[PDB]
Amino acid sequence: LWIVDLNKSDLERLGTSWSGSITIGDKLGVSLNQSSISTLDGSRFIAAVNA
Amino acid sequence: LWIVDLNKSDLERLGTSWSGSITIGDKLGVSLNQSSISTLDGSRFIAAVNA
Amino acid sequence: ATPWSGYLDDVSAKFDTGVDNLQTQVTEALDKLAAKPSDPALLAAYQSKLSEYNLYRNAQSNTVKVFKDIDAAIIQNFR
Amino acid sequence: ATPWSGYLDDVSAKFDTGVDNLQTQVTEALDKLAAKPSDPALLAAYQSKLSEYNLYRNAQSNTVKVFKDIDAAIIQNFR
């Protein structure tokens, strides 16, 4: 009894994501694509890269 | 036996949310779109952005 | 969202908002005194300010610690 | 038809209607304490409500079994 198994697979991930925060004049916080409070009271940006 | 599945999807999200708190002297204050006044001087606002 | 705060940090903030400007005054006095260390007008002033700041911080920390102990004693009895 | 209810159902329901609102009081006090976990007033309230609820559910479930054990004992003698 002959039993035979064969497999192939090919995969690819590539690109970037972004989020961040600024503060202006102690009037306005702004946050982009964060669920955070923008707690720092100062400008932060955070890139994410994978390849 | 031939079993076939096909799937397509699209989504998009865009725009802004706003809330804040404003204080006039000690005696007066106003809360906009938020359960309570920020015990804070002057004014503060937040503009959550989704894109 | 508003920066979330509890009870203990609000009792803490009560002191910071009780002393309107002491935090800055303490630096201003140091600045001018360091500018002319032998001036006795400046010295008695800085002595006053620093003696104030020291009691401010002590009373703050102790009050926070007592209000923690009162809560832990109740939360233990939930079992 | 109206939902059928027996004698054990009756006995059980007497507790639910005996405690008017406890069943919801214990939900509100939780949402509050969870909003501000470090206030002693909220703690002192929730301790009471949760105790009363625990005792209610125990007295209910024991009483229903005591009745079930009488009925099952009588039905055995029909033979």
Added chain:
Amino acid sequence: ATPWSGYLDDVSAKFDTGVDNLQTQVTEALDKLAAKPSDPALLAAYQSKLSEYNLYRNAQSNTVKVFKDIDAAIIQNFR
């Protein structure tokens, strides 16, 4: 009518109606003192108030627990 209250509720509330105004006096003194942290007449007041508040909340929670145990021991014997 009034929110349902059991035996434990009616025991806990006895303390609150015993210390008629302490719950306010503590915050009052706390604010007066935070206004001027370096004043001995204020410190000597707040020490007393806070000590009283601590003892009160503690003895309350212990008594409510003891009355929970006395009941659970009885309920267990129904079965």
Added chain:
Amino acid sequence: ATPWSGYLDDVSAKFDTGVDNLQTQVTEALDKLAAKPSDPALLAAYQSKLSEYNLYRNAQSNTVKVFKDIDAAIIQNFR
């Protein structure tokens, strides 16, 4: 709807969503404090925060235990 959840998961998540962001606030205030360990403002902040995180996790784990006890007491009476 969420990957799965029992009633206890829900009681836990009520705390985790009741303290909106304390986890990250504490996680970062440490990264401030460690870089300049000798600033009294930074210290008083971190003290006030870590006390909150303590009490939070404490009452969280106790509530789950009490609901597990109440359920076990009823399931035991089926048989």
Added chain:
Amino acid sequence: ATPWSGYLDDVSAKFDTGVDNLQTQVTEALDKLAAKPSDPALLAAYQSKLSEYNLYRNAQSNTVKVFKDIDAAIIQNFR
């Protein structure tokens, strides 16, 4: 009109008419202690009264159950 009392009722009544006055002593103690919680003369008395009450209730219940099971075992042999 007056209650029919069985045998277990007589057993329970022996305890109730044994502690002539404790039932009310406990309540008076609580009332005054709650009026002025910080008095060690009140505290030292209330501790004793509450402990006596706990033991009384516990012994009463345990006793009743034992008589119940003796009777049940005799009745079973009629069949």
Added chain:
Amino acid sequence: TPWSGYLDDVSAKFDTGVDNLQTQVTEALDKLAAKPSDPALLAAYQSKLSEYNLYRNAQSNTVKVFKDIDAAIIQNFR
């Protein structure tokens, strides 16, 4: 399944009634084993393990009750 009695149907109701808890607890164990001192991982595992415990208890008692009902009926054929 090749064959499934009424009792099996009852048990399977519980199994299919809890979606994925079987694996959730398994994964949580390995995570916690990787960092036995993280409060978050602890607070997660306490919940999952309690839930699992109650699931198994409720499952096993019901099957017994239904067994006794059937045994009682079957006895009276005589």
Added chain:
Amino acid sequence: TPWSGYLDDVSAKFDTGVDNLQTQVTEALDKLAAKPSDPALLAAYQSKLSEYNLYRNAQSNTVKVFKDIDAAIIQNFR
């Protein structure tokens, strides 16, 4: 006999989760005992000893809770 029940497996997961702690705890002890009055060694030891304490406590409680889940099922076989 490489025989290992479910409880053995559940325990082994911790042993293999803390790969080297088992010995780090002794290395630190020996070098501390060589010179007890050094802050760097004291600060290291504290952080290792505490981790080992919490490791053994979580290890034993998990085992007990599983045993109490099994015994409640086996009781119903009658």
Added chain:
Amino acid sequence: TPWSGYLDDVSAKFDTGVDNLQTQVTEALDKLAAKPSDPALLAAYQSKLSEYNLYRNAQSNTVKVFKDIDAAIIQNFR
């Protein structure tokens, strides 16, 4: 090979947050030992030794608090 938990991580954050004090305090002592009567070196070493004293004190207490918070959860597993 290396293994690190949450508590030693919390220590490491301090060790990395004081970039060089570990060495500065060692050097200033040597300098002072060379000429103890220089008030410059005296004021320097006073500054450093106080900074080191605080760094160690706060480190240990932080670790201890995070041990206690874990023990209080693992106690409720049973």
Added chain:
Amino acid sequence: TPWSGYLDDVSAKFDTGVDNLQTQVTEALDKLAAKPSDPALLAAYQSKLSEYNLYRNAQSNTVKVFKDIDAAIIQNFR
């Protein structure tokens, strides 16, 4: 030769670690008491005394920790 436990081993590790300090302290106190007012002798004696103190203190706290880990495990044999 005589039976020794794990807590004995952990204790003795310190006795063998600080090889001679017990003797050095017994000597330094004698030669100090022979002339209490030599500042070189005072400065020598202060170190040995402080070392002895920290030695015995670490020794006992370690033992107590290892005791309570074991009492915690034994509590679950039930």
Added chain:
Amino acid sequence: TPWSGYLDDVSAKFDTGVDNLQTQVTEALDKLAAKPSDPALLAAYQSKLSEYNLYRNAQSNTVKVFKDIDAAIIQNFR
């Protein structure tokens, strides 16, 4: 020899395991009582007494677990 049961054998394995602790712990006391303020004596007695404590608790708990296994089997002969 007198009759001895399986629980006796299990019990005695401990006693014969700790060959001499049974008396070491008494001699240590007799010495320490002579000069209660000798740290060399105290450091030894703390260890011996901790060992004795753990020994007796492990003994009793083991005996009880075997009693409850046997009782559970004997129950089903009926």
